Amino acid sequence: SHRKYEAPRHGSLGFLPRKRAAKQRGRVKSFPKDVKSKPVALTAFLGYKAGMTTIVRDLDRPGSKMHKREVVEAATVVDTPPMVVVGVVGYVETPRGLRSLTTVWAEHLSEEVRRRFYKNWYKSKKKAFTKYSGKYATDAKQVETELARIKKYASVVRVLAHTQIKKTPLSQKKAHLAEIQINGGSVSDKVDWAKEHFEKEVSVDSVFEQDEMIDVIAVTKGHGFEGVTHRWGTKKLPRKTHRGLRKVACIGAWHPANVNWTVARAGQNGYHHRTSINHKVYRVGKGTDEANGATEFDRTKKTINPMGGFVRYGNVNNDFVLLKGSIPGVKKRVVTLRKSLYVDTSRRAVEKVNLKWIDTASRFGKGRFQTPAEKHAFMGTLKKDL
Amino acid sequence: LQDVVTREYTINLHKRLHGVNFKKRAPKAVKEIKKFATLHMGTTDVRLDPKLNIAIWKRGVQGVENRMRLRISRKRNAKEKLFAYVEPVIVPSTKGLQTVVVE
Amino acid sequence: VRYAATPANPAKSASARGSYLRVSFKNTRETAQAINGWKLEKAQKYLDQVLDHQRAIPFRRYNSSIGRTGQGKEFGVTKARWPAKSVNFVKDLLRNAQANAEAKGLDSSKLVISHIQVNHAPKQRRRTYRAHGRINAYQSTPSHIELTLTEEQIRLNSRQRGRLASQKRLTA
Amino acid sequence: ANLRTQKRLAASVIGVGKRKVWLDPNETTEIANANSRSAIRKLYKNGTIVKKPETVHSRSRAR
RNA sequence: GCGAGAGACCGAUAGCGAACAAGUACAGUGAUGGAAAGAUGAAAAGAACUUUGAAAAGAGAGUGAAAAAGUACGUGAAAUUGUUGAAAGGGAAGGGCUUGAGAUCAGACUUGGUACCGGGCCAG
RNA sequence: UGCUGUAAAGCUGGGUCGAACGGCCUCUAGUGCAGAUCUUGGUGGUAGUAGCAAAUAUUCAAAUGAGAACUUUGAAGACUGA
RNA sequence: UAACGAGAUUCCCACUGUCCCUAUCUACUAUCUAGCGAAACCACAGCCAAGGGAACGGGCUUGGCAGAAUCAGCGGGGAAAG
Ligand SMILES: [Mg+2]
Ligand SMILES: [Mg+2]
Ligand SMILES: [Mg+2]
Ligand SMILES: [Mg+2]
Ligand SMILES: [Mg+2]
Ligand SMILES: [Mg+2]
Ligand SMILES: [Mg+2]
Ligand SMILES: [Mg+2]
Ligand SMILES: [Mg+2]
Ligand SMILES: [Mg+2]
Ligand SMILES: [Mg+2]
Ligand SMILES: [Mg+2]
Ligand SMILES: [Mg+2]
Ligand SMILES: [Mg+2]
Ligand SMILES: [Mg+2]
Ligand SMILES: [Mg+2]
Ligand SMILES: [Mg+2]
Ligand SMILES: [Mg+2]
Ligand SMILES: [Mg+2]
Ligand SMILES: [Mg+2]
Ligand SMILES: [Mg+2]
Ligand SMILES: [Mg+2]
Ligand SMILES: [Mg+2]
Ligand SMILES: [Mg+2]
Ligand SMILES: [Mg+2]
Ligand SMILES: [Mg+2]
Ligand SMILES: [Mg+2]
Ligand SMILES: [Mg+2]
Ligand SMILES: [Mg+2]
Ligand SMILES: [Mg+2]
Ligand SMILES: [Mg+2]
Ligand SMILES: [Mg+2]
Ligand SMILES: [Mg+2]
Ligand SMILES: [Mg+2]
Ligand SMILES: [Mg+2]
Ligand SMILES: [Mg+2]
Incomplete structure (x- = not known):
């Protein structure tokens, strides 16, 4: 018999299997399509999810009821020291x-x-790349030969870059090494750019501009084994159901005499690889700037960091990217920021963002001050101040 | 390295007992103190002074103090060449106290 | 008594037996197979580390729906356990056979566990009580264990011969 | 090594419950040899066996 | 019932329920119901003694015609199981037919006759 | 280990074992098992699996012992609460 | 027919996670370990689709396919067990 009433399916069949990601570093499945006429440039960058904040912004969207009016928006901070x-x-x-x-x-x-x-650095002789480092002995003709081979035969050139994770508050000492495709120019141009950038730092401001729309590649938050009710958003069974209610009542008809792949089943939830697109860049901050969190309307000399630091991350003392909204992953996660794969000319994509104010109250509670100076001005002298 | 040594430590039993079953908080304070002495003295043979047991259980099964000041002595002992002896230190307040070698 | 395997050189071997031991047969089979063919001192150190949970006994046959552990990677398995009663019975029998080898004048640093096996012993019956006034079996599955420590022309056809001879004559 | 009988005898000789009998932990051999009520009386008089004081229930708050 | 002699009877799941401390143990309020259970060796000669072990035991030794008879006792099948050895194995295995490979077994120089006569088998 | 018979089966090499047993002509029968939710006994897979979760709660030390979560004693923390 | 009713029924107020629409928290499980350790059930077994067939196959025919050993869950099938 047919369903008595119609209803949409619970969950998407386009994100199966709901298994753990094979790696914690999200991998760029697809890079932007190469245009030769453009200059030689990187197409991605690696950063670390620090935390979320709030901004105030004047909206520029004619025909909207919020046009030229202040909006309060959630933003994500990605700590992005230069990659090598x-x-x-x-x-x-x-x-x-x-x-x-x-x-x-x-x-x-x-x-x-x-x-x-x-895997065990402390017990090692640390022999990695020592003979290869010897390959550069006084003529580096092996290196020049391999570079000529790449120039002669390669159609896609990618650089190998690693994060400087020692500049982040993370206790992890392993850098994150990734391939970032080089777009623009000829293959020879790409190879020359990579060679001249060997052992050099590349900053975020050379890959992403403000007001850009970028994509985020990351592995989401892990939740472990989860039942169908929260894994798939199915309806809870009535209160008086024997043996429990956080189930799917019918997991199949008699025929096919098998359980179908489309039925919601309990299993591991979260810690999935996701590619999330169209996140607007509200700020490409600089680590050397002492007014990271200051705007043109809030001239308080102020870094992007909240009071007491980002909870379970620390302070962002580096260059950073301030993105609109939320991105997949947790705090301290390595995040891959990729350039957009298409040209968006919509007003949301081409709007120029000018920030009014960035929230730097404590995220560890109902913080009500933006600065210790503001706190002292409000409260006056305390006993510990003598 | 000296095998026979006495030091005074402050142990933060509050964070070690965070979320623990209320009828297991004092037994677990016993196990946390043993693991603390193994951490500091390097010996898996840890002996608790009964006055320490009285101080742990003084306020019942879930009344363990947030901080305890312990005196831990490594002494010559077997299957274990040394052992650690933990006994309480009576102090006015258990705050602001650093690790001290007792000569 | 007859052992399952007799040593090749009885003068360089020592044996030990334990019969009607009230220890799990399946666990004891796994722990005996874990040290079959080892050096005696290496197996003794290994069994100590098993008792200390520094290392595990791989369960290979009687392992259905037991837990997984990272201490099984050493043996290329995922299912391994730490059966203390079986390890202690086996350690006692290794100690006994080592004492027998010393009484024979053999050298312990050269001893190898050349033979070890576990058989079913007769069951020990008890009773368990079930819903609706029923009685069921509550048997034990005991073990017999035994072990031994050992110190460490062509005929050719007429024409095959003819061909061979004529090939020699070609080579001077 | 098993002073269960001695504690029961001491409770009966003293006239209190077994919960109020104190057997000297440092005199286990001497108490273990006290097989009779006469020897229990002797140890009670010597202080090897002590009648523990009653737990106080004060009526001060009720008053 | 008492006393005898027999058998083309049964041979310990048989023959009486009972070959044994059997109408016993045990069950049921009760009337009643009611089993299982034979076999070391000619003879305990039932393993002194030494050694490892907390002990049970083990290892040597000893008795014996035999311990491949140690009371958990003649022989000691099968199911089921351990070890050793051999082999095979992509969602069963097993079977028939045929050949290969490996293993085992067999056979004419015969009960051969006097360098020769002649014979056996496989082939041209 | 093989041989004989279309077959039911018979004979034989090796190992184990210890006291009786067979061929042939006949007689006789409680005479042949894969099944009967067969009978009695024995044994598996399941499976080292289900499980060993009501009644607030145990802990430190010493003694004893080959061996102590569980025994004894001491110290404490609790409960039954007439 | 007053009163009474763990009787059946309708409406109203109060009340609320019954629901919109779920979320969070505690203990005991489950889980992993040491020890202990059953039972139901079992022709042989265990991947699908169609066919034919005692007219709804795990086995047959024709195709799809098909790679050791496994753990926690689960309730489609075994026309599952009793
Ligand atoms: Mg419909
Ligand atoms: Mg959850
Ligand atoms: Mg119900
Ligand atoms: Mg917060
Ligand atoms: Mg909690
Ligand atoms: Mg399991
Ligand atoms: Mg029961
Ligand atoms: Mg009953
Ligand atoms: Mg009979
Ligand atoms: Mg009978
Ligand atoms: Mg017999
Ligand atoms: Mg014989
Ligand atoms: Mg015999
Ligand atoms: Mg026999
Ligand atoms: Mg067999
Ligand atoms: Mg398979
Ligand atoms: Mg063949
Ligand atoms: Mg052949
Ligand atoms: Mg005889
Ligand atoms: Mg005759
Ligand atoms: Mg008949
Ligand atoms: Mg039969
Ligand atoms: Mg038939
Ligand atoms: Mg039957
Ligand atoms: Mg039966
Ligand atoms: Mg279990
Ligand atoms: Mg239960
Ligand atoms: Mg009370
Ligand atoms: Mg009434
Ligand atoms: Mg069937
Ligand atoms: Mg089908
Ligand atoms: Mg049909
Ligand atoms: Mg079927
Ligand atoms: Mg087929
Ligand atoms: Mg279920
Ligand atoms: Mg089903």
Whole structure:
């Protein structure tokens, strides 16, 4: 018999299987399509999710009832110290897909990226890349030969870059190393850019501008094993149901005499790889700026950090990206910021953002001050102040 | 390295007992103190002074103090060459106190 | 008494037996197979680390719906346990066979567990009480354990010969 | 090593409950040899066995 | 019932329920119901003694024709199981037919006759 | 270990074992098992699995012992609450 | 027919997680370990689709396919068990 009444399916069949991500570092499935006429530039950057804040902004959207009027908006802070370029990979077009031909490395790799190649660094002789570092002996013709091979045969060139995780408050010492595709210019142009950027820092301001729409690649928050009621949002069974109610009552008809893949079942929830698109860049802050959180209307010399620091992260002492809204992942997660894969000319994409004010009250409670100076001005002298 | 040594420590039993079953808070304060002495003296043989047991249980099964000042002595002992002896230190307040070597 | 396997050189071997031991047969089979063929001192250190949960006994046959552990990676398994009663009975029998080898004058640093096996012993019956006035079995599955420590032309056809000879004559 | 009988005898000799009998923990051998009520009387008089004081229930708040 | 002699009877799941401390143990308020259970060895000669172990036991030794008879006792099947060895194994396995491979077994130089006569088998 | 018979089966090599047993001509029968939710006994897979979760609650030390979460004693923390 | 009713029924006030529409928290489980350790059930077993067929196959025919050993859950099937 048919359903008595119609209802939509619970959950999406396009995000199956609901399994744990194979890696905690989200991987760029697809890079922006290459245009030769553009200048040579990176297409992605790695950062760390610090926390969320609030801004106030004047809206520029004609025809809206909030046009030219202040809106209060949630924003996400991504701590993004400069990444270090250490390598370059060439890819070849084959009737079976892209194939990595050769990887050329820089002469010197920092300890934080050489820890990436170890499970037990403290017990090791730390021999990684020592013979390769010797390959640069006084002529580096092996390196020049591999670079010429990439120039001659590669169609896609990606750089190898690692985060400087020692500049973040994280206790982890392993850097995060990722391939970032180089777009723009010829293959030779890309190879020359990578070689000249070996062992150099690349900042976020060279990849992302303000008001850009960018995508976020991350692994979401893990929740462990979860029942169908919260994993899939199914209806709770009546209160008087025997053996429990956080279930799906019928998991299949008699035929097919199997359980179908489309039925909601209990299992692991969260910790999934997600690609989230169209997050607007409200701010590309600078770590050297002592007024990170100050705007043109709030001239309080103020960093982006809330009072008492970001909860369970610390302070953002680096360059940062302030994104509109929420991004997948948790605090301290490595986040991949990717350039948009299409050209959006909508007013939401082309609006120019000018911030009025950034909230820096404590996130550890109902904070009511933006600054210790404001706190002291409000409360006056305390006993501990003598 | 000296194998025979006495030091005074403050142990924060509050964070170690956070969320613990109320009828298991004093037994777990016993286990946390043993693990504390293993952490500091390096010995899995940890002996608790009965005056320490009285101080732990003084306010019942869930009345364990937030901080306790302990005197821990490593002494020569077996299957364990040394052992740690934990006994209480009576102080006015258990705040602001650092680790001290007792000569 | 007859052991299952007799040693090849009885002068370089020592044996031990334990019969009607009230220890789990399945656990004891797994712990015996975990040290079958080992050096005696290496197996003794290993069984101590098992008693201390520094290392595990891999459960290979009688392991249905038991837990998984990271201490099984050493043996390429996921299902391993730490059966203390079986380890203690096996340690007692290894100690006894080592005493027998010392009484024979053998050298303990050269001893190898060359033979060890577990058989079912006769069951010990008890009673369990069930819903609706029923009685069920509550048996024990005991073990017999035994172990031994050991110190460490071509005929050719007429034409096959003819071909061979004529090939020699070609090579001077 | 098992002073269960001695504690029962001491409770009967003293006239209190077993909860109020104190057996000297440092005199286990001597108490273990006290097989009779006569020997229990002797240890009670010597102070090896002590009648513990009653737990106070004060009527001060009721008054 | 008492006393005898027998059998083409049964041979310990049989024969009486009972070959045994059997109308016993045990059940049921009761009337009643009612089992299982034979076998070391000619003879206990039932393993002194040494050694490891808290002990049970083990290992040597000893008795014996035999311990491949140690009272958990003649022989000691099968189900089921351990170890060793051999082999096979992509959502069962097992079977028939056929050949290969490996293993085992067999057979004419015969009960051969006097360098030769002749024979056996497989083939051209 | 093989041989014989279409077969039911018979014979035989090796191992184990210890006191009786067979061929042939006949007689006789309580004479042949895969099944009967067969009978009695024995044994598996399930499976080291379900489980060992009511009645507030145990802890430190010493003694004893080969061995102590569970025994004894002491100290404490609790309960039954006439 | 006053009164009475763990009797059946309708409406109203109060009340509320019954619901919109779910979320969070506690203990005991489950879980993992040491020890202990059953039972139901069992022709052989265990991937699908169609066919034919005692007219709804795990086995047959034709296809799809198909890679050790497994853990927690689960209730589609075993026309599951009793
Ligand atoms: Mg419909
Ligand atoms: Mg949850
Ligand atoms: Mg109900
Ligand atoms: Mg907060
Ligand atoms: Mg909690
Ligand atoms: Mg399990
Ligand atoms: Mg029961
Ligand atoms: Mg009853
Ligand atoms: Mg009979
Ligand atoms: Mg009978
Ligand atoms: Mg017999
Ligand atoms: Mg014989
Ligand atoms: Mg015999
Ligand atoms: Mg026999
Ligand atoms: Mg068999
Ligand atoms: Mg498979
Ligand atoms: Mg063949
Ligand atoms: Mg052949
Ligand atoms: Mg005889
Ligand atoms: Mg005859
Ligand atoms: Mg008949
Ligand atoms: Mg039969
Ligand atoms: Mg039949
Ligand atoms: Mg039957
Ligand atoms: Mg039966
Ligand atoms: Mg279990
Ligand atoms: Mg239960
Ligand atoms: Mg009370
Ligand atoms: Mg009435
Ligand atoms: Mg069937
Ligand atoms: Mg089908
Ligand atoms: Mg049909
Ligand atoms: Mg079927
Ligand atoms: Mg097929
Ligand atoms: Mg279920
Ligand atoms: Mg079902």
